[PDB]
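Bump. Still looking for tetanus toxin heavy chain structure tokens.
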Amino acid sequence: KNLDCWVDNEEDIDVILKKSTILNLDINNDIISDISGFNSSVITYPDAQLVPGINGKAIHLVNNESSEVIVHKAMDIEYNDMFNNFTVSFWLRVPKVSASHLEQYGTNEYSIISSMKKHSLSIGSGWSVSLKGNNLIWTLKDSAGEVRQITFRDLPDKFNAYLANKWVFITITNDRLSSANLYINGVLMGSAEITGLGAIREDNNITLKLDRCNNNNQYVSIDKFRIFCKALNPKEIEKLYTSYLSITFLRDFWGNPLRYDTEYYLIPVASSSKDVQLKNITDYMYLTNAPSYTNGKLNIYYRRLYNGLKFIIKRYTPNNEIDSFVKSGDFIKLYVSYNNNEHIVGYPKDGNAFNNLDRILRVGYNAPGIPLYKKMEAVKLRDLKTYSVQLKLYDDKNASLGLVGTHNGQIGNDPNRDILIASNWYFNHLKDKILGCDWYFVPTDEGWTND
Ligand SMILES: CC(=O)N[C@H]1[C@H](O[C@@H]2[C@H](O[C@@]3(C(=O)O)C[C@H](O)[C@@H](NC(C)=O)[C@H]([C@H](O)[C@@H](CO)O[C@]4(C(=O)O)C[C@H](O)[C@@H](NC(C)=O)[C@H]([C@H](O)[C@H](O)CO)O4)O3)[C@@H](O)[C@H](O[C@H]3[C@H](O)[C@@H](O)[C@H](OCC[Si](C)(C)C)O[C@@H]3CO)O[C@@H]2CO)O[C@H](CO)[C@H](O)[C@@H]1O[C@@H]1O[C@H](CO)[C@H](O)[C@H](O[C@]2(C(=O)O)C[C@H](O)[C@@H](NC(C)=O)[C@H]([C@H](O)[C@H](O)CO)O2)[C@H]1O
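Sorry for the wait, here they are.
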């Protein structure tokens, strides 16, 4: 018998998952508690705040001694990790670090989560999760003081990286016979042999807090903090990852829930370096290259954000008391905000259409008495793991005018352009890996500022 816990029946993955869970932090009605089944006190200090999460509110930590969350483990699950296998998982959101902060604070390692033995004059064995610039570190120290680490260096392209302001899922497995393995969003990101380490008792406390960080602006966000009593297999890591990916409220680009009456810049997943722009009022919209920021000495670059048109989302039919969140299947109206005026986005009756099937959207098209088709459904049709959205346009008899996307061509006498359209064409390509109808909604956020 080895180190993974209770073994009986070969059952569902979902069963194994629950039956090997030893701590599980959920947040409900603003209380942070453990729902694993065991009880473990969770003490929330005065300055540990709460923010929009992946499936409810999540824990937010700033850089002062008041911003902390501690779990005292129950006397049942208090040994476990001494010579045993274990797995740690959590969702994490770390803002994008400015080029000044990297110049200044890039070599500064500091803890965010840990459980390491509290001694009279020192600190002993256990584990820690920490960060250093744009690197994510996992650390193990045994009783003899021997150390093994996993250091993951994030991607230089910040529009696509894991440590640059979107929600990402972290999972870390430990097999005291082969290895420590780090995964991000279900994909093995690095590893380390831990054969030869001895005892790893752990402190009776698990501390969530910023420790030894020299930057008083740094902050992180953490959610569903969870511990298993075994080393999870790749299959199980995956079912755990998507179990959180409920479909009901849509998501903006950072992976927070989508909202009505708030400004968003659109970016097509298929060409993430173009922004959307406007020909003229009553006219159409087309794509253009976004300006970029690059800094080879710091090892960083990205397409810049916040240029283009600002879109706003309104309930097709007015609410009554209701939430501000947009669910999938929700029918909305889509406006463009330009020159202190809001113009509706839509398609008219016998308006221009590449090959009479791809209808070219117009912004604020007004006319005598000419039907302007604007009813849209905002849904998630594909690619669960990506914070993207699809828009379906209807006409006045509830027929499909199709999905919002783009098609290349050339109007009047402007130059060739990728122009915005609606067509039922996408409906036959839904299984492609990349597809021109997937869109990102991007709001201004304090965690991403352009250099
Ligand atoms: C314009 C177009 O290609 N597709 C629109 C579509 O068109 C047709 C038609 O093509 C059809 C078709 O899809 O409907 C039908 C046709 O019978 C077949 N041909 C054959 C024999 O298979 C083609 C075929 O499937 C294609 C794909 O188009 O074939 C090749 C090919 O020809 O061999 C494959 C080859 O690798 C390609 N090479 C390239 C360019 O890299 C070529 C190439 O794309 C074209 O050959 C050159 O443009 O395609 O599919 C038309 O061929 C046909 O054309 C008429 C012509 O218009 C007319 O003037 C002519 O008159 C006659 C001669 Si005369 C007057 C001198 C005597 O008659 C010909 C023949 O009839 O017209 C058809 C209907 O009018 O129609 C739909 C309708 O809704 C759309 O408009 C299609 O365009 C797509 O629109 C979308 C939304 O509007 C998107 O923008 C698509 O674009 C992306 C995307 O998914 O977003 C853009 C991405 O960057 C791109 N990434 C890549 C490269 O991977 C993707 C990618 O293409 C796909 O995602 C792969 O899945 O597309 C638009 O494509």
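The helical segments are 13-19, 99-105, 234-242.

Edit: fixed formatting.
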